[PDB]
């Protein structure tokens, strides 16, 4: 778990860019890597930044395990122009806006072993059928326009993203780096390792069911209601 | 070794050598070379040049490369050549790079950074730049911002002006990293500051900028401006200026008003006789110009601005009324001008009836402008002043005279000759562009430094880097930003320094014998040796954990705090070893006093008389220490906070130094001690921070932080003791009834409700026997005014344990302008421990605001913890 | 006190009180065995020593319950600090006893105070104080409430616990003279009682509602009949800025001193 | 030890008069006055006044504090 003391989210998110690359070069240099991000658009940007700081190392296109001639059949199917580039160097990304064919392609390229790194929107943590060796979660908050504030990733989500580093067929280990805010550091240190408690919410969301159940005559009177409870 | 100019001669008198050089001869206009009017240069840029019909010769020389190329620039031209308007064009190009047909200069594409060496200069520059560029409607402002309140403010700001230092801290924190990649242009103005002790900063800026561009592949224009000095090609190499198309050099002959230089060095060893000799040289030199002409005296003292005057006066009276009649007659030349302006704030009332007056920031605010008006219109031919007059609003003088060249440096603990840029600026004020034929200037100095001041004002002087002194601090901050992981990246970084090209092209000077230079041509092994010692220094003071084997650095929070506050690595380790949870205020001050930044401050015999009085008039006992530097610094800080005036000048300057550095120092203390979690001391330290910022103790009424308030009213409410939070219960009438000043009743009320107030609720539920969940609901209770609270208001929320001893958790909560009155919901978890305690406390406190706090006991008296969970 | 120099000597002294905190002694002497035995949680003791001063006595009021099924031991779970001021030999605290909600669950066990010089007896000022509380308060039981005297030994702290005997209670109710040797005072008046320190549970503090507790620096603002409320929060140290307003309110200055050194150099923010 | 006990305070008087002059000028001045007064055996005071005059105007009531002082070294 990597604590960052910058509260202002843009600055924080930006200043964890370099650590992402380093987290790869450290924990999983040659093995598949998935990076989860707070924003639909952030996926592009982070794929780019991974490539631009990839140049720094004096090491270019280290995440591409096949020649450019092989990727051409796959790239013919693309609309997004930047995705072509990011894929050309071995990265690529997945998000809401991508055509299902584009997504299927990227997934194929990753699992087959052609591209070593994929940056993915957070929303795709649940429905993603392609696993990895190292998983790097970048900045566990997201933005909500309704109250105009950032709000933390639901814990089960985080656990799911973490579980996305599993490769039982081959690897003897699997790795995860979670870069988060100062505040949110201790919480993860406590609750990712221990088994989780789970509590009921029915007390709050209650009316709809009593109504529906009364309709079926499963609750005919107040007593039946307590019994149902 | 130095050089004559052409017609120059040495004539030595008793006790002083006097050197004379004549004015330079302007280079004859080249074949078919004309000035450029404001017509024949591109359509858009022409706007905002109004009032000015023609371009200056040099401006006209390089305008082409200015607006037609992204190639980097270096110009070396003498003071007075008007360098700004060159750089201005380099800006008007970028301002033009983003333009539309149906809208002009759409401003979210680009931002420009103008780095100027002096504060007054920055102020006045934003002042005039605003007016000028306003035709475009582009918003230009000074960056004085504290980081967090004004970021989102300067978000919408373009072409931001700042001192190199400001840019460096603000980049170390990352306030810049939200701005950058929107930056296509940075201006380094007066880049010859490379030679100053401040030099390493400019070196750190530019090095970072270049080293960064190599990673991003996105480039930036860099425009350097310098006084005319050798080592121009070295500064060129540093700025990555292609010497072919990018380099520009002009010698001292291009000063718009030719300068006849007079330098009198004094041979007298005894200072007691010297303080006569220089007086007399002043008198003779001033009587030389006592006819129709204008003199300006730059003294480096505050008070001596008027001590130098009245000496000239009493001398002219002792002259049997000779030297007087500074006019063409009795009534002629407007002596009624000098007489009818009579009543003024300063001591001017004595000097004004006669021919001369004084100017400086201290005595008045508006009457400085009222004196500047008087000098421009030539009603006063003798004006004695300070360097801030040369650095501030621009007015020249027919002939200027620099008295003594030596100043008092509280940073150095002693006296030292003033900086390069100070003379260059104040002597570059010599002669008018309009009303003058040629300017002269007279530097009265010590003979020993007489060689030096010649190597400057004629281009003999090398520009060298002071980088080595600061190398350990520079390296840290780069590790802190993550721009250097290991030794290799460190040598790569240092390879971008000015000190690198200087170590390359003059190894003899920088400590490299030529043979071992041949043995290592690239300086790989010297740059590896260099930085290795910095690495060791940072390791020994615990800024970095770096093992020799890997060559890798690891940052520590202490290191980050150090970088972020621009505090040296000796001071920070002093704090590491000294700071303990149990420190009283009594001791906190001492630890502050032990800051390595103050190492040279000492206590003088003469002032130990006043320090004792001050020592007994301070609220926080120093008495742990006797008279030694610790005591002086301590009693000084207290004096500043307690707002006490000091008789000695030495102490005043000293105090100023101490208090200015104190903000960063105390703050780094707070940050450290907070990261540790030690509740009591983080309170004592943030409160100290506020007390320094606001210049008052907490025991004084919070209403004082609103400067809008009358002093007598404040003192009146302090007279009767009526606890401040009890003002909210009272209406507009009930307020005035306390102090029996009912006419004030409304206005007071406004402020009481302007004072930031949060009310807070909490919903607490246990999660496991170890941890509880807390939902804190912050509801703003105060009336927002952006002319008081501004764009943002900052608060620390921290939950403290049973004894208010340990801080179990803390967040930085920031309520923006828009959202006052909107309740914010913060959710966080806290641990509980085996002797389940009676309660926690949830504290919320404004960062900057003093006496502004709300505490919320969270009681566990009824808490029922969950059943422990089976294996 | 000298009110100037006297303040500061003791002030830089008290900044080391926390050193005492880890060397403490407790009187072990003959146990009546029919008596109650009081357990003092160590944390409150530490903090109480830390706020004090080495000359002026400060005092605090004890509140606790007996553990379930164990009526003969009294756990002290709370200390309350009220507006007060001391002498070197005694402490003046107001007539009103603590009233507050967190307190309703527990019983009063008496009080505890700092004692600049160690004496192996309960000071007449104390037995008199205690009896006079007890007279006015039925809430305080003669047999259940004690006086814990915490004395500052060299580099240390050392404490004893007393109970009034009925002889003592009557003498004290009666006694006017507050001098160090009143008429009719006897060692028969008090009795030592058994007390233990403990790390097993944590005690907590109650503290004045609209002010702090320490009135030593304002004696004229303190009155026997003064009323106060309470809150859950810890005591501030003796010399804490708040207890000392008169001293931070020493500023006589004209603003224009700032005119001098009007060179403003800042350059940072 | 006693000579310097009062030599410092001589320097105080200097600053009080002159103000915060550069070190060299403060201590140099000290050497001057101390040198002038010290030859009491020279005595005079008419001459001493002339010697003092060589310093011109110092007001007065200070110059006495430098009298009784300069007797005490």
From Swiss-Prot, chain C:
UniProt note on tissues of expression: Widely expressed.
Localization per record: Nucleus; Nucleus speckle
Disulfide bonds: none
Domain MPN: 37-168
Entry's transmembrane regions: none
Domain of life from the UniProt record: Eukaryota
Disease: Retinitis pigmentosa 13: A retinal dystrophy belonging to the group of pigmentary retinopathies. Retinitis pigmentosa is characterized by retinal pigment deposits visible on fundus examination and primary loss of rod photoreceptor cells followed by secondary loss of cone photoreceptors. Patients typically have night vision blindness and loss of midperipheral visual field. As their condition progresses, they lose their far peripheral visual field and eventually central vision as well.
Subunit and partners: Part of the U5 snRNP complex. Component of the U4/U6-U5 tri-snRNP complex composed of the U4, U6 and U5 snRNAs and at least PRPF3, PRPF4, PRPF6, PRPF8, PRPF31, SNRNP200, TXNL4A, SNRNP40, DDX23, CD2BP2, PPIH, SNU13, EFTUD2, SART1 and USP39. Component of the U5.U4atac/U6atac snRNP complexes in U12-dependent spliceosomes. Within the minor spliceosome, which acts on U12-type introns, interacts with PPIL2 and RBM48. Core component of U2-type precatalytic, catalytic and postcatalytic spliceosomal complexes. Found in a mRNA splicing-dependent exon junction complex (EJC) with SRRM1.
The name this protein goes by in its record: Pre-mRNA-processing-splicing factor 8
Taxonomic lineage from the root: Eukaryota, Metazoa, Chordata, Craniata, Vertebrata
Gene: PRPF8
Full-length numbering of the shown residues: 2067 to 2335 of 2335
Swiss-Prot record, chain D:
Compartmental location: Nucleus
Expressed in which tissues: Widely expressed.
Transmembrane segments annotated in the record for this chain: none
Illness association: Retinitis pigmentosa 33: A retinal dystrophy belonging to the group of pigmentary retinopathies. Retinitis pigmentosa is characterized by retinal pigment deposits visible on fundus examination and primary loss of rod photoreceptor cells followed by secondary loss of cone photoreceptors. Patients typically have night vision blindness and loss of midperipheral visual field. As their condition progresses, they lose their far peripheral visual field and eventually central vision as well.
Role played: Catalyzes the ATP-dependent unwinding of U4/U6 RNA duplices, an essential step in the assembly of a catalytically active spliceosome. Plays a role in pre-mRNA splicing as a core component of precatalytic, catalytic and postcatalytic spliceosomal complexes. As a component of the minor spliceosome, involved in the splicing of U12-type introns in pre-mRNAs. Involved in spliceosome assembly, activation and disassembly. Mediates changes in the dynamic network of RNA-RNA interactions in the spliceosome.
Recorded domain comment: Contains two helicase domains. The N-terminal helicase domain has catalytic activity by itself, contrary to the C-terminal helicase domain that may have a regulatory role and enhance the activity of the first helicase domain.
Subunit-structure text: Component of a core complex containing at least PRPF8, SNRNP200, EFTUD2 and SNRNP40. Component of the U5 snRNP and U4/U6-U5 tri-snRNP complexes, building blocks of the spliceosome. Component of the U4/U6-U5 tri-snRNP complex composed of the U4, U6 and U5 snRNAs and at least PRPF3, PRPF4, PRPF6, PRPF8, PRPF31, SNRNP200, TXNL4A, SNRNP40, DDX23, CD2BP2, PPIH, SNU13, EFTUD2, SART1 and USP39. Component of precatalytic, catalytic and postcatalytic spliceosomal complexes. Component of the minor spliceosome, which splices U12-type introns.
Family under the similarity heading: Belongs to the helicase family. SKI2 subfamily.
Name this polypeptide is given: U5 small nuclear ribonucleoprotein 200 kDa helicase
Species of origin: Homo sapiens (Human)
Residues of the full protein shown: 107 to 179 of 2136
């Amino acid at each position: 778990i990597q604590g960052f003391n910058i509260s202002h989210t843009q600055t924080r998110l930006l200043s964890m860019a370099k650590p992402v690359y380093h987290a790869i070069t450290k924990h999983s240099p040659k093995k598949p890597v998935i990076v989860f991000v707070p924003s639909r658009k952030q996926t592009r940007l982070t794929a780019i930044d991974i490539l631009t700081t990839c140049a720094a190392d004096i090491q270019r296109q280290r995440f591409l395990h096949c020649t450019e001639k092989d990727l051409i059949p796959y790239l013919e199917k693309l609309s997004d122009s930047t995705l072509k580039e990011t894929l050309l160097n071995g990265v690529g990304y997945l998000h809401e806006g991508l055509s299902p064919m584009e997504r299927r392609l990227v997934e194929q390229l990753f699992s087959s072993g052609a591209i070593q790194v994929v940056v993915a929107s957070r929303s795709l943590c649940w429905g993603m059928n392609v696993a990895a060796h190292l998983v790097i979660i970048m900045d566990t908050q997201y933005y909500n326009g309704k109250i105009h504030a950032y709000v933390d990733y639901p814990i089960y989500d985080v656990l799911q993203m973490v579980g996305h580093a599993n490769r039982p067929l081959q690897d003897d280990e699997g790795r995860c780096v979670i870069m988060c805010q100062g505040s949110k550091k201790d919480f993860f240190k406590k609750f990712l390792y221990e088994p989780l408690p789970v509590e009921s919410h029915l007390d709050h969301c209650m009316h709809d069911h009593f109504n529906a159940e009364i309709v079926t005559k499963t609750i005919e009177n107040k007593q039946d209601a307590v019994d149902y409870l | 070794r130095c050089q004559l100019p052409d017609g120059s001669f040495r004539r030595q008198r008793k006790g002083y050598e006097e050197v004379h050089v004549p004015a330079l001869k302007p280079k004859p206009f080249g074949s078919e070379e004309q000035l450029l009017p404001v017509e024949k240069l591109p359509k858009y840029a022409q706007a905002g040049f109004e009032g000015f019909k023609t371009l200056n010769r040099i401006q006209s020389k390089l305008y082409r490369a200015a607006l037609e190329t992204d190639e980097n620039l270096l110009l070396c031209a003498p003071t007075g050549a008007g360098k700004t308007n060159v750089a201005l064009m380099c800006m008007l190009r970028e301002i033009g790079k983003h333009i539309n047909m149906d809208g002009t200069i759409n401003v979210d594409d680009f931002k420009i950074i103008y780095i100027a060496p002096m504060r007054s200069l920055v102020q006045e520059m934003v002042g005039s730049f605003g007016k000028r560029l306003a035709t475009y409607g582009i918003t230009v402002a000074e960056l004085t911002g504290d980081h967090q309140l004004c970021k989102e403010e300067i978000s919408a700001t373009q072409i931001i002006v700042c001192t190199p230092e400001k840019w460096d801290i603000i980049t170390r924190k990352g306030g810049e990293r939200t701005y950058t990649q929107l930056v296509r242009l940075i201006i380094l103005d007066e880049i010859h500051l490379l030679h100053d002790d401040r030099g390493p900063v400019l070196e750190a800026l530019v090095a970072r900028a270049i080293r960064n561009i190599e990673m991003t592949q996105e480039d930036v224009r860099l425009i350097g401006l310098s006084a005319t000095l050798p080592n121009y090609e070295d500064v060129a190499t540093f700025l990555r200026v292609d010497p072919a198309k990018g380099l520009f050099y002009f010698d001292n002959s291009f000063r718009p008003v030719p300068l006849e230089q007079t330098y009198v060095g004094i041979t007298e060893k005894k200072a007691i006789k010297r303080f006569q000799i220089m007086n007399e040289i002043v008198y003779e030199k001033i009587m030389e110009h006592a006819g129709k002409n204008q003199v300006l005296v730059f003294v480096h003292s505050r008070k001596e601005t008027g001590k130098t005057a009245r000496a000239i006066r009493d001398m002219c009276l002792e002259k049997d009324t000779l030297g007087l009649f500074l006019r063409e007659g009795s009534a002629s030349t407007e002596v009624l001008r000098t007489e009818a302006e009579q009543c003024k704030n300063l001591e001017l009332k004595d000097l004004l009836p006669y021919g001369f007056a004084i100017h400086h920031a201290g005595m008045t605010r508006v009457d400085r402008t009222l004196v500047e008006d008087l000098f421009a219109d030539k009603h006063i031919q003798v004006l004695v002043s300070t360097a801030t007059l040369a650095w501030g609003v621009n007015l020249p003088a027919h002939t200027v005279i620099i008295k003594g060249t030596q100043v008092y440096s509280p940073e150095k603990g002693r006296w030292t000759e003033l900086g390069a840029l100070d003379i260059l600026q104040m002597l570059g004020r010599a002669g008018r562009p309009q009303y003058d034929t040629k300017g002269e200037g007279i530097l009265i100095t010590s003979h020993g430094e007489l060689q030096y001041y010649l190597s400057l004002l004629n281009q003999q002087l090398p520009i060298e880097s002071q980088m080595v002194s600061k190398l350990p601090d520079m390296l840290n901050a780069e590790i802190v930003l993550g721009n250097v992981q290991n030794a290799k990246d460190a040598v790569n970084w240092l390879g971008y320094a000015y000190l690198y090209i200087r170590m390359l092209r003059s190894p003899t000077l920088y400590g490299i014998s030529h043979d071992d230079l041949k043995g290592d041509p690239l300086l790989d092994q010297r740059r590896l040796d260099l930085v290795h010692t910095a690495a060791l220094m940072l390791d020994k003071n615990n800024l970095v954990k770096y093992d020799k084997k890997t060559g890798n650095f690891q940052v520590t929070e202490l290191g980050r705090i150090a970088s972020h506050y621009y505090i040296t690595n000796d001071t920070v380790q002093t704090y590491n070893q000294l700071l303990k949870p149990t420190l009283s205020e009594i001791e906190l001050f001492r630890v502050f006093s032990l800051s390595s930044e103050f190492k040279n401050i000492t206590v003088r015999e003469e002032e130990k008389l006043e320090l004792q009085k001050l020592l007994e008039r301070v609220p926080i006992p120093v008495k742990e220490s006797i008279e030694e530097p610790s005591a002086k610094i301590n009693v000084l800080l207290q004096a500043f906070i307690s707002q006490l005036k000091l008789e000695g000048f030495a102490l005043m300057a000293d105090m100023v130094y101490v208090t200015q550095s104190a903000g960063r120092l105390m703050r780094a203390i707070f940050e450290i001690v907070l990261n540790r979690g030690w509740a009591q001391l983080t309170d004592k330290t943030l409160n100290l921070c506020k007390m320094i910022d606001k210049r008052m103790w907490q025991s004084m009424c919070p209403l004082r932080q609103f400067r809008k308030l009358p002093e007598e009213v404040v003192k009146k409410i302090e007279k009767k003791n009526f606890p401040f939070e009890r003002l909210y219960d009272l209406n507009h009438n009930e307020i005035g009834e306390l102090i029996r000043m009912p006419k004030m009743g409304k206005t007071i009320h406004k402020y009481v409700h302007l004072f930031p107030k949060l009310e807070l609720s909490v919903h607490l539920q246990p999660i496991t026997r170890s941890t509880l969940k807390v939902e804190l609901t912050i509801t703003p209770d105060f009336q927002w005014d952006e002319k008081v609270h501004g764009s943002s208001e900052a608060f620390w929320i921290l939950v403290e344990d049973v004894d208010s001893e340990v801080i179990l958790h803390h967040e930085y909560f920031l309520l923006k302008a828009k959202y006052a009155q909107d309740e914010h919901l913060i959710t966080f978890f806290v641990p509980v421990f085996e002797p389940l305690p009676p309660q926690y406390f949830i504290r919320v406190v404004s960062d900057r605001w003093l006496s502004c706090e709300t505490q919320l006991p969270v009681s566990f008296r009824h808490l029922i913890l969950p059943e422990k969970y089976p294996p | 006190f000298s009110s100037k120099t006297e303040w500061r000597v003791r002030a830089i002294s008290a900044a080391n009180l926390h050193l005492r905190t880890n060397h403490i002694y407790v009187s072990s002497d003959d146990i009546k065995e029919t008596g109650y035995t009081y357990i003092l949680p160590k944390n409150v003791l530490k903090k109480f020593i830390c706020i004090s001063d080495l000359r002026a006595q400060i005092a605090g009021y004890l509140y606790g319950v007996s553990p379930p099924d164990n009526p003969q031991v009294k756990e002290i779970r709370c200390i309350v600090m009220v507006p007060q001021w001391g002498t070197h030999q005694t402490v003046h605290l107001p007539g009103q006893l603590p009233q507050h909600e967190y307190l309703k669950e527990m019983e009063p066990l008496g009080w505890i105070h700092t004692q600049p010089n160690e004496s192996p007896q309960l000071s007449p000022q104390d037995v008199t104080t205690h009896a006079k509380i007890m007279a006015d308060n039925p809430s305080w039981d003669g047999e259940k409430t004690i006086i814990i005297t915490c004395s500052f030994t060299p580099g240390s702290c050392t404490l004893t616990a007393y109970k009034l005997t009925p002889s003592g209670y009557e003498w004290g109710r009666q006694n006017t003279d507050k001098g160090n040797n009143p008429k009719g005072y006897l060692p028969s008046h008090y009795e030592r009682v058994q007390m233990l320190l403990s790390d097993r549970f944590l005690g907590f503090f109650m503290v004045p509602a609209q002010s702090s507790w320490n009135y030593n620096f304002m004696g004229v603002r303190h009155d026997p009949n003064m009323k106060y409320e309470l809150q859950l929060a810890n005591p501030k140290e003796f010399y804490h800025e708040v207890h000392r307003p008169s001293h931070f309110l020493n500023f006589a200055l004209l603003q224009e001193g700032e005119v001098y050194s009007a060179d403003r150099e800042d350059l940072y923010a | 030890k006693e000579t310097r006990e009062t030599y410092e305070v001589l320097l105080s008087f200097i600053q009080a008069a002159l103000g915060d002059q550069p070190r060299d000028i403060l201590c140099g001045a000290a050497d001057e006055v101390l040198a002038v007064l010290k030859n009491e055996k020279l005595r005079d005071k008419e001459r001493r006044k002339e010697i003092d005059l060589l310093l011109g105007q110092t007001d007065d009531t200070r110059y006495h504090v430098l009298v009784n002082l300069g007797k005490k070294i």
